[PDB]
Amino acid sequence: LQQSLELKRKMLRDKQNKKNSGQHLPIFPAWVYERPALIGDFTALPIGTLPLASQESAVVEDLLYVLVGVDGRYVSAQPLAGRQSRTFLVDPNLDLSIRELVHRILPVAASYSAVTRFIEEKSSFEYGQVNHALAAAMRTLVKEHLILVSQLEQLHRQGLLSLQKLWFYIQPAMRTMDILASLATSVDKGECLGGSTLSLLHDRSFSYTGDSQAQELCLYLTKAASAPYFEVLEKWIYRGIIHDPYSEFMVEEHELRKERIQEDYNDKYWDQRYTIVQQQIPSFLQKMADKILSTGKYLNVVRECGHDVTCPVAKEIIYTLKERAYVEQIEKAFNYASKVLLDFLMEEKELVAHLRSI
Amino acid sequence: AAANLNAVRETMDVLLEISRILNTGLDMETLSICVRLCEQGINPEALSSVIKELRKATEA
Amino acid sequence: MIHELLLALSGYPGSIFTWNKRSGLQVSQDFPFLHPSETSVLNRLCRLGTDYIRFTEFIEQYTGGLHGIYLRAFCTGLDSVLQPYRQALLDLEQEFLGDPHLSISHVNYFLDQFQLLFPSVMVVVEQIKSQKIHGCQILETVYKHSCGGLPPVRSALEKILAVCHGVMYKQLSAWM
Amino acid sequence: LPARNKILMLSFDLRVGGLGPKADRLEELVEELELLEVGSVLDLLV
Amino acid sequence: ITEAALVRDILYVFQGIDGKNIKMNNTENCYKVERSLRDTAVRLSELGWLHNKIRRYTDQRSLDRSFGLVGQSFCAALHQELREYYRLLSVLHSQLQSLTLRRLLVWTYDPKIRLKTLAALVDHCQGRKGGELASAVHAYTKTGDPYMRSLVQHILSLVSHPVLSFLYRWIYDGELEDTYHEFFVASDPTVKTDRLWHDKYTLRKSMIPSFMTMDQSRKVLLIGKSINFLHQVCHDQTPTTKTDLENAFQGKIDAAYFETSKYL
Amino acid sequence: IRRYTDQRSLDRSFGLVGQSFCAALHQELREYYRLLSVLHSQLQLT
Amino acid sequence: NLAAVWDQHLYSSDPLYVPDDRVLVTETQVIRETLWLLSGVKKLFIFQLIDGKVTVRNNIIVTHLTHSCLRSVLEQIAAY
Amino acid sequence: QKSPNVLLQNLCCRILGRSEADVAQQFQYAVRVIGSNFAPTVERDEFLVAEKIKKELIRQRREADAALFSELHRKLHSQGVLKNKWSILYLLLSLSEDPRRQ
């Protein structure tokens, strides 16, 4: 809890020194993290003296509240919250039969309070453009979870739901939450951000290749989380611009103008001006990784000399599985890049004549 | 009985208003048959398919 | 209630919304009929009516103290800014007449756009009274608030300023 | 109404009751026949 | 204290009006009920605490002509957005003559996120006015989250319309008219008989808005100064001498720059 | 039947035709629960 | 139902109080009265005149109107 | 005409703009499918249907209607439709189309 406050600042300092062109990178007010209400999680008759089929209605009533994160009269949410594992405490005096079942329906709660904490903490400007999209499309599945607990309440109101019916009813969403809660542990555990959490979403999608109940959820989280990364590549491939406000994109632009300017002592443009990053490569684009850099660097050395260089058409690119259509587009742009630079060089700055008169 | 006639005309008018918001295409009289049928416990998924499939048959 | 308020917002104050010189249409009673807190909603709503009661007293005296042909022109204007605030109190009742469930809130939402034109057109009127901008320097105090910035009160004050320009285009047409 | 229309209308009921292809068999029997006799049979439900 | 009692009260703590069995008893902390049910109210009652921040600041900031043309326009928008939260509340009221959708937790969720972001934008825009404020909103359109990026980027279009109003006049019209110090050029009045061109106009550096290149700010002055040098000295009053902003500045501004200078 | 599925998804080495078999044997365990639900409903069954 | 405002005098009943008798005229009748008055007519039951001074009749009540607000609007018409 | 089957003839004859007895060949289409299913197997709850039409309505650049629909959804609740609210409205959705083809 207190330990988290550090990580957010240390990461903030790194983007501030790296880019002084864009100033005052945004931060959220202190209360955003301090207020505990904003995040989801936070006369009692002796049950021992009750008849059996009344305890079931009570336990069902308390569980219906636990699913949305609000404490219950007979079942309490333990506040240790130590490490990352949430735990729950059921009343000691109940029927062993009912108690065991409750524990078997209780894992969807530990996979609801842990899931919600990740959607608050990894929504700050510091964690980077993709970690924001992953949690902003993970928050939509929470609303659809809240939807289901409301329909179950109406059935409970009409005396027409039981703990054996509830158990069967929640099985489909016990799985969706389990895939979202494990994926969130991993994106957090490796301190992954930028493209290190756009590879972890491509690989997990392969892990389940036959299931199709969980495969559609993951394939969706990558369509949603890759929307900002593809937008950066679309600018770099079709223009030399690398907006990249936080340091996340695979290509980086070193300010080697300070040393090499007026005299390009290092011929930096073709050496160390536009250079590559290794741990921020998406793992699906590793085959085209080298080409991307060349695709965009070539654009600059005509965009540097004032001759207008414009792609004839800029085509949009979307993550996809089983269909590498992005491959053909990267190539269609790459080929125009080299062609334009070579044509300008062999007519303007004509190299054939200069080479003879040397 | 006059109040009964105003109740039905008021609610059929509200239902027509939603129909245009969803842009479904039903006119007032087809909406009249549709609610009158669904009023007796009709599985409305079955009816929806029937209406879609005849609208596609009447295309010739 | 929905006819007592939909006339209390208009000039007639009534028993619920008692009028006073220091503060206007301030209802002060604990009523079993209204919910304990609707008075808090009403207090916010009452702010709008108080200025409508006052704006008409000022147009009344005009159209030693302030006098002139301009106060007979800024005042005709204060009638036109207030015209879409009269038609919008008539419609509230028409909806309220048939629908028996709509509650005070619908009044709040429908009459929330009149909490930007009215508060910032009230400072122009107090300025013209505290300082006797009686001569042709009345046009200055409309064009000094007309650059504005809150867009609803920026075209409202424009309606008032142009009327002045029509009186200032008739005296200067007879001369030239 | 013509004869063919007043057979299907009857057929639908049985399906709600639970009598199924015993109601389609009826559709095919009529279809196989393709006179006003069915109209008389129609009047005589029981 | 049955639940039918809580639902009636919570539906007003959304405006922010203290309820019957719910009140802001601790003046800084969020409202406290005076057991499972009690806890549920807290999440629902947060919208009121957030509501208190945005409303208490657009009530007052709106009446201050000092904040500046930019800032009063930010308030219009914080307020036009609050108006909409009230169309949702009016319905909920009529739905009272069940409506206990987990006590409306699912009803409140879409306004609750649209309340966290405007409430954040008010304290990040505190102190700042004029151009600096405009950048502090362009600051909040750098978040991948699609729904929050849809919301701010609309407010910014309104906030920066006055700004571009000073941009499309001080280039085309010839003169600049700001009472408070907001625009990114700083004229200094003095005789300037023959010294006019070199000293009367200078680029201020706190008020160039964040969505502009320093090259663009420098070029815009070169047009504002040229179209004004052309009236007050050369005495040739030829009237109507004819995504940052959807990539139209780099298209229009060079265009204005080119015509003007060629004539001078 | 449930002890085996409880351990294979706790094994990242069971493969990619083993993590398809182990996800096919829950659809046929869920329906057993569906039948149990009905057994419970008619209780108010010997 | 909010079409019977001031019909309940429970608020008035909270302290001991005597109710005063009122005619209970309909809102529709009032419009016919003013239109005749705005034109030349004398001796109208509403807006009773006494000495060249037309004055709102002392006791008139409506289902959806409190006595004070009705007096305010009626006096206001009577001035014209 | 109250009885269920009778209605379809009329429904069919206007949907299919033809004569009364002529349309029977296609009319036969509905008799089998509608008969196939009468007793719905999905439980009753209007809120889900209501929540669906706002979402559908919202991703189509038409968001005021996310509450205009809500205002209408209570207007009918005020009058009497005999608990068929879920069944009607649901129908009206599944026959949907954004005005733009997109």
CSV table of C-alpha atoms in Angstrom, one decimal, chain E residues 15-217:
chain,number,residue,atom,x,y,z
E,15,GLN,CA,-27.1,16.3,-5.8
E,16,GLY,CA,-25.2,16.6,-2.5
E,17,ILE,CA,-28.1,17.7,-0.3
E,18,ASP,CA,-27.6,16.2,3.2
E,19,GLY,CA,-30.1,13.2,3.6
E,20,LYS,CA,-32.3,12.3,6.7
E,21,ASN,CA,-30.3,9.2,8.0
E,22,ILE,CA,-27.2,10.1,5.9
E,23,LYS,CA,-25.2,13.4,6.5
E,24,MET,CA,-21.7,14.8,6.0
E,25,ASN,CA,-21.3,14.6,9.9
E,26,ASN,CA,-17.5,14.9,9.6
E,27,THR,CA,-17.1,18.0,7.5
E,28,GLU,CA,-14.1,16.8,5.4
E,29,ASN,CA,-14.8,13.0,5.4
E,30,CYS,CA,-17.5,11.5,3.1
E,31,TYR,CA,-21.2,11.1,4.4
E,32,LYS,CA,-21.6,8.6,7.3
E,33,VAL,CA,-24.9,6.7,8.0
E,34,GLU,CA,-26.3,7.6,11.5
E,35,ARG,CA,-24.8,-3.6,8.3
E,36,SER,CA,-24.1,-4.9,4.9
E,37,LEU,CA,-26.5,-2.2,3.7
E,38,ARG,CA,-24.5,0.5,5.5
E,39,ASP,CA,-21.3,-0.3,3.7
E,40,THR,CA,-23.0,-0.3,0.3
E,41,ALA,CA,-24.1,3.3,0.7
E,42,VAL,CA,-20.5,4.5,1.0
E,43,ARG,CA,-19.6,3.7,-2.7
E,44,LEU,CA,-22.9,5.2,-3.8
E,45,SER,CA,-22.4,8.3,-1.6
E,46,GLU,CA,-18.9,9.1,-3.1
E,47,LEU,CA,-20.6,10.5,-6.2
E,48,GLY,CA,-21.9,13.3,-3.8
E,49,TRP,CA,-18.5,14.1,-2.4
E,50,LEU,CA,-17.1,14.3,-6.0
E,51,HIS,CA,-20.2,16.3,-6.9
E,52,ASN,CA,-19.5,18.8,-4.1
E,53,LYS,CA,-16.1,19.6,-5.6
E,54,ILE,CA,-17.0,20.4,-9.2
E,55,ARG,CA,-20.3,22.3,-8.3
E,56,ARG,CA,-18.9,24.6,-5.5
E,57,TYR,CA,-16.1,25.7,-8.0
E,58,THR,CA,-18.2,26.4,-11.1
E,59,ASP,CA,-20.7,28.3,-9.0
E,60,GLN,CA,-18.0,30.8,-7.8
E,61,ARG,CA,-15.4,30.7,-10.7
E,62,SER,CA,-18.2,31.7,-13.0
E,63,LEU,CA,-18.8,35.1,-11.3
E,64,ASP,CA,-15.1,36.2,-11.4
E,65,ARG,CA,-14.4,38.3,-14.5
E,66,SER,CA,-10.7,38.2,-13.4
E,67,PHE,CA,-10.1,34.4,-14.2
E,68,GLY,CA,-10.2,35.5,-17.8
E,69,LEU,CA,-12.0,34.7,-21.0
E,70,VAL,CA,-10.2,31.4,-20.9
E,71,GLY,CA,-11.4,29.8,-17.6
E,72,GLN,CA,-14.9,31.2,-17.7
E,73,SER,CA,-15.4,28.9,-20.8
E,74,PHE,CA,-14.0,26.0,-18.9
E,75,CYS,CA,-16.7,26.6,-16.3
E,76,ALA,CA,-19.6,26.7,-18.8
E,77,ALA,CA,-18.4,23.1,-19.8
E,78,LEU,CA,-18.0,21.7,-16.2
E,79,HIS,CA,-21.6,23.0,-15.7
E,80,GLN,CA,-23.2,21.9,-19.0
E,81,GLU,CA,-21.7,18.4,-18.0
E,82,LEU,CA,-23.3,18.7,-14.5
E,83,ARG,CA,-26.7,19.5,-16.1
E,84,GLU,CA,-26.6,16.0,-17.8
E,85,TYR,CA,-25.9,14.1,-14.5
E,86,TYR,CA,-29.3,15.7,-13.3
E,87,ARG,CA,-31.3,14.2,-16.3
E,88,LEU,CA,-30.3,10.8,-14.9
E,89,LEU,CA,-31.2,11.8,-11.3
E,90,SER,CA,-34.7,13.2,-12.4
E,91,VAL,CA,-35.7,9.7,-13.8
E,92,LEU,CA,-34.5,7.8,-10.8
E,93,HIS,CA,-36.9,10.0,-8.7
E,94,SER,CA,-40.0,9.2,-10.9
E,95,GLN,CA,-38.9,5.5,-10.8
E,96,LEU,CA,-39.9,6.0,-7.2
E,97,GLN,CA,-43.6,5.6,-7.9
E,98,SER,CA,-38.6,-2.2,-7.3
E,99,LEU,CA,-35.5,0.1,-7.9
E,100,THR,CA,-32.8,-1.5,-5.7
E,101,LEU,CA,-30.4,-2.6,-8.5
E,102,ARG,CA,-27.8,-3.5,-5.9
E,103,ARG,CA,-29.1,-0.1,-4.7
E,104,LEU,CA,-28.4,1.2,-8.2
E,105,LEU,CA,-24.7,0.4,-8.1
E,106,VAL,CA,-25.0,-0.5,-11.9
E,107,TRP,CA,-27.1,2.6,-12.5
E,108,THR,CA,-24.5,4.9,-11.0
E,109,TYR,CA,-21.3,3.3,-12.6
E,110,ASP,CA,-21.3,5.3,-15.9
E,111,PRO,CA,-21.7,8.8,-14.2
E,112,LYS,CA,-19.2,7.7,-11.4
E,113,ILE,CA,-16.1,7.5,-13.8
E,114,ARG,CA,-17.2,10.7,-15.6
E,115,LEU,CA,-17.2,12.3,-12.1
E,116,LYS,CA,-13.6,11.0,-11.1
E,117,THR,CA,-12.1,12.8,-14.3
E,118,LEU,CA,-13.8,16.2,-14.1
E,119,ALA,CA,-13.1,16.3,-10.3
E,120,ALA,CA,-9.3,15.6,-11.1
E,121,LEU,CA,-9.3,18.3,-13.9
E,122,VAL,CA,-10.4,21.1,-11.4
E,123,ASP,CA,-7.4,20.7,-9.0
E,124,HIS,CA,-4.8,20.3,-11.9
E,125,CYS,CA,-6.2,23.6,-13.4
E,126,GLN,CA,-6.0,25.4,-9.9
E,127,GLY,CA,-3.9,28.6,-9.9
E,128,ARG,CA,-3.4,28.5,-13.7
E,129,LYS,CA,-5.5,30.8,-16.0
E,130,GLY,CA,-5.2,31.8,-19.7
E,131,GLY,CA,-3.0,29.8,-22.0
E,132,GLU,CA,-1.4,27.9,-19.1
E,133,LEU,CA,-4.8,26.5,-18.2
E,134,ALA,CA,-5.4,25.4,-21.8
E,135,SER,CA,-2.2,23.3,-21.7
E,136,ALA,CA,-3.3,21.8,-18.4
E,137,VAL,CA,-6.3,20.2,-20.2
E,138,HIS,CA,-4.2,19.1,-23.3
E,139,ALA,CA,-2.2,17.5,-20.4
E,140,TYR,CA,-5.3,15.2,-19.5
E,141,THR,CA,-5.7,14.0,-23.2
E,142,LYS,CA,-2.6,11.8,-23.0
E,143,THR,CA,-4.3,8.8,-21.5
E,144,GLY,CA,-4.9,5.6,-23.4
E,145,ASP,CA,-8.3,5.0,-21.6
E,146,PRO,CA,-10.8,5.5,-24.5
E,147,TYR,CA,-13.9,6.8,-22.6
E,148,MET,CA,-11.9,9.5,-20.5
E,149,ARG,CA,-10.0,10.5,-23.7
E,150,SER,CA,-13.5,10.9,-25.5
E,151,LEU,CA,-14.6,13.2,-22.5
E,152,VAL,CA,-11.7,15.6,-22.0
E,153,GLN,CA,-10.9,16.1,-25.7
E,154,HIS,CA,-14.4,17.6,-26.0
E,155,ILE,CA,-14.0,20.1,-23.1
E,156,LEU,CA,-10.6,21.1,-24.7
E,157,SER,CA,-12.4,22.1,-28.0
E,158,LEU,CA,-14.5,24.7,-26.0
E,159,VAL,CA,-11.7,25.9,-23.7
E,160,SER,CA,-9.4,26.7,-26.6
E,161,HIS,CA,-12.0,28.4,-28.9
E,162,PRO,CA,-11.5,31.8,-27.2
E,163,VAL,CA,-7.7,31.3,-27.6
E,164,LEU,CA,-8.0,30.6,-31.4
E,165,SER,CA,-10.4,33.6,-31.5
E,166,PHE,CA,-7.4,35.8,-30.4
E,167,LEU,CA,-5.3,33.8,-33.0
E,168,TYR,CA,-7.7,34.4,-36.1
E,169,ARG,CA,-8.1,38.2,-35.3
E,170,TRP,CA,-4.4,39.2,-34.4
E,171,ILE,CA,-3.4,37.7,-37.8
E,172,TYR,CA,-6.4,38.7,-40.1
E,173,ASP,CA,-8.1,41.7,-38.3
E,174,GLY,CA,-4.8,43.5,-37.5
E,175,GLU,CA,-5.3,44.4,-33.7
E,176,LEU,CA,-5.3,42.4,-30.4
E,177,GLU,CA,-7.8,43.1,-27.5
E,178,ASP,CA,-7.2,41.2,-24.2
E,179,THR,CA,-7.8,43.0,-20.8
E,180,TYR,CA,-6.2,40.3,-18.6
E,181,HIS,CA,-2.7,38.8,-19.6
E,182,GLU,CA,-3.8,35.6,-21.4
E,183,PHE,CA,-2.6,35.6,-25.1
E,184,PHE,CA,1.0,34.5,-25.8
E,185,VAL,CA,2.2,37.9,-27.3
E,186,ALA,CA,2.8,41.0,-25.0
E,187,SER,CA,2.4,44.5,-26.5
E,188,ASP,CA,4.0,47.4,-24.5
E,189,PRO,CA,2.5,50.9,-25.1
E,190,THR,CA,4.9,53.8,-25.8
E,191,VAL,CA,5.6,56.4,-28.7
E,192,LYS,CA,7.4,53.8,-31.0
E,193,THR,CA,7.6,56.4,-33.8
E,194,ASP,CA,10.3,54.7,-35.9
E,195,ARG,CA,11.2,52.1,-33.3
E,196,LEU,CA,7.8,50.4,-33.7
E,197,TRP,CA,8.8,47.3,-35.7
E,198,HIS,CA,11.8,46.3,-33.4
E,199,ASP,CA,10.2,46.7,-29.9
E,200,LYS,CA,6.4,47.0,-29.6
E,201,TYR,CA,5.6,43.3,-29.9
E,202,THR,CA,7.3,40.4,-28.1
E,203,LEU,CA,6.6,36.7,-27.6
E,204,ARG,CA,5.6,36.0,-23.9
E,205,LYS,CA,6.6,32.3,-23.0
E,206,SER,CA,4.1,31.2,-20.3
E,207,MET,CA,1.0,31.4,-22.6
E,208,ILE,CA,1.9,29.7,-25.8
E,209,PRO,CA,-0.7,26.8,-25.5
E,210,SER,CA,0.8,23.2,-25.3
E,211,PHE,CA,-0.7,22.1,-28.7
E,212,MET,CA,1.6,24.7,-30.6
E,213,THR,CA,5.2,24.5,-31.9
E,214,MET,CA,7.5,27.4,-30.7
E,215,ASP,CA,8.2,27.9,-34.4
E,216,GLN,CA,4.4,28.6,-35.0
E,217,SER,CA,4.2,31.0,-32.1
